[PDB]
Amino acid sequence: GYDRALSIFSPDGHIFQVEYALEAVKRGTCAVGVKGKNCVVLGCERRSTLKLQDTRITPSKVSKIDSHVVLSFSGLNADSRILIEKARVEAQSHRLTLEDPVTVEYLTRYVAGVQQRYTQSGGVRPFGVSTLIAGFDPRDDEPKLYQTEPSGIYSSWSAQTIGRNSKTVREFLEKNYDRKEPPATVEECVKLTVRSLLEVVQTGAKNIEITVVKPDSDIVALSSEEINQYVTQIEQEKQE
Partner 1 sequence: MTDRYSFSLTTFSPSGKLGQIDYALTAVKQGVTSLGIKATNGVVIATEKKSSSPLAMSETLSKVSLLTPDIGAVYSGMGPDYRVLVDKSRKVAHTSYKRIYGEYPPTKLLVSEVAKIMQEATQSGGVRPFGVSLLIAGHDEFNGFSLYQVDPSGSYFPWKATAIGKGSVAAKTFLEKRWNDELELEDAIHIALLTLKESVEGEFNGDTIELAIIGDENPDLLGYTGIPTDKGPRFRKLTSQEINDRLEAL
Partner 2 sequence: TTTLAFRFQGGIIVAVDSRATAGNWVASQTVKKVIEINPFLLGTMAGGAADFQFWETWLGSQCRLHELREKERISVAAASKILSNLVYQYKGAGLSMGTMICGYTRKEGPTIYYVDSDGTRLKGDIFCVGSGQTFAYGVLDSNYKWDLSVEDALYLGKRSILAAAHRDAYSGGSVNLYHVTEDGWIYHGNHDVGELFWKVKEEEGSFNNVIG
Partner 3 sequence: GSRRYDSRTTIFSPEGRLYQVEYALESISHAGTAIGIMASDGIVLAAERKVTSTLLEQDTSTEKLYKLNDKIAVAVAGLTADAEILINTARIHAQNYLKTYNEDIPVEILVRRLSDIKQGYTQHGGLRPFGVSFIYAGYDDRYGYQLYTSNPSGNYTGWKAISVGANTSAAQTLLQMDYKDDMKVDDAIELALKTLSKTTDSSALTYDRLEFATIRKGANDGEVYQKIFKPQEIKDILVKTGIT
35 membership: H or E segment, kind and range: strand 31-35
Per-residue DSSP letter, 127: P
Residue 141, interface with partner 2 (CB under 8 A)?
A: no
Shortest gap between Cβ of 17 and partner 1 (angstroms)?
A: 16
Q: Are 219 and 70 in contact (CB under 8 A)?
A: yes
Q: Are 129 and 79 in contact (CB under 8 A)?
A: yes
Helix 77-98, helix 104-117: angle, nearest 10: 130
99 binds, among partner 1, partner 2, partner 3, none (CB under 5 to 8 A by kind): partner 2
22 binds, among partner 1, partner 3, partner 2, none (CB under 5 to 8 A by kind): partner 3
213 membership: H or E segment, kind and range: strand 208-214
Residue 205, interface with partner 2 (CB under 8 A)?
A: no
106 binds, among partner 3, partner 2, partner 1, none (CB under 5 to 8 A by kind): partner 2
**Which residue lies nearer to partner 2 by CB, 89 or 98?**
98
**Which residue lies nearer to partner 2 by CB, 113 or 204?**
113
Residue 139, interface with partner 2 (CB under 8 A)?
A: yes
Q: Which of 99, 174, 181, 225 binds partner 2 (CB under 8 A)?
A: 99
Q: Which of 85, 100, 187, 216 binds partner 2 (CB under 8 A)?
A: 100
d(CA 44, CA 168): 15
Residue 23, interface with partner 2 (CB under 8 A)?
A: no
Residue of 39, 89, 96, 33 lying closest to 66 (CA atoms): 89
Q: Are 77 and 131 in contact (CB under 8 A)?
A: no
Residue ranges that bind partner 2, judged by CB under 8 A:
97-100, 106, 139
